[PDB]
DNA sequence: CGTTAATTAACG
DNA sequence: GTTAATTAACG
DNA sequence: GTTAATTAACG
DNA sequence: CGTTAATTAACG
DNA sequence: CGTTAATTAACG
DNA sequence: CGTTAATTAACG
């Protein structure tokens, strides 16, 4: 999934 | 940590 | 701050 | 699954 | 032109 | 893959 | 009050 | 599943 | 020397 911020 | 709005549908 | 890629 | 490399969209 | 943020790249 | 709302294009 | 073309995320 | 704070819209 | 209302992209 999307990168952690 | 949210950034800019995504493009709209 | 920039947003999503176009 | 970790991390840096590379890109690009912010500004004015 | 530079910087922060996003996205691509690597094995 | 397709839909329908949004956004960009056009001049 | 301009209108269609192109793009966008959503859906399972 | 669903709150939180950042972002964006609204007003002007 | 702009705040409030509404929206949404973050999270563990
Ligand atoms: Mg400024
Ligand atoms: Mg400045
Ligand atoms: Mg023509
Ligand atoms: Mg008033």
Descriptive overview:
The PDB classes it as dna binding protein. The entry lists the keywords Mammalian High Mobility Group protein (HMGA1) AT-hook peptides, DNA binding protein. The assembly is nonameric. 3 copies of one chain form a homotrimer. Chain A contains no helices and no strands. By secondary structure, the first copy, chain A, is largely without helices or strands. Chains in contact: B-C. Chain B binds chain C through residues 3-7, and chain C through 1-4. Chain B binds 6 DNA strands through loops.
Keywords summarizing the entry:
homotrimer; 5 residues; little secondary structure; rod-shaped; binds magnesium ion; DNA-binding; dna binding protein; Mammalian High Mobility Group protein (HMGA1) AT-hook peptides; nonameric; High mobility group protein HMG-I/HMG-Y
């Amino acid at each position: 999934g999307r990168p952690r911020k | 940590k949210r950034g800019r709005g995504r493009p709209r549908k | 701050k920039r947003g999503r890629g176009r």
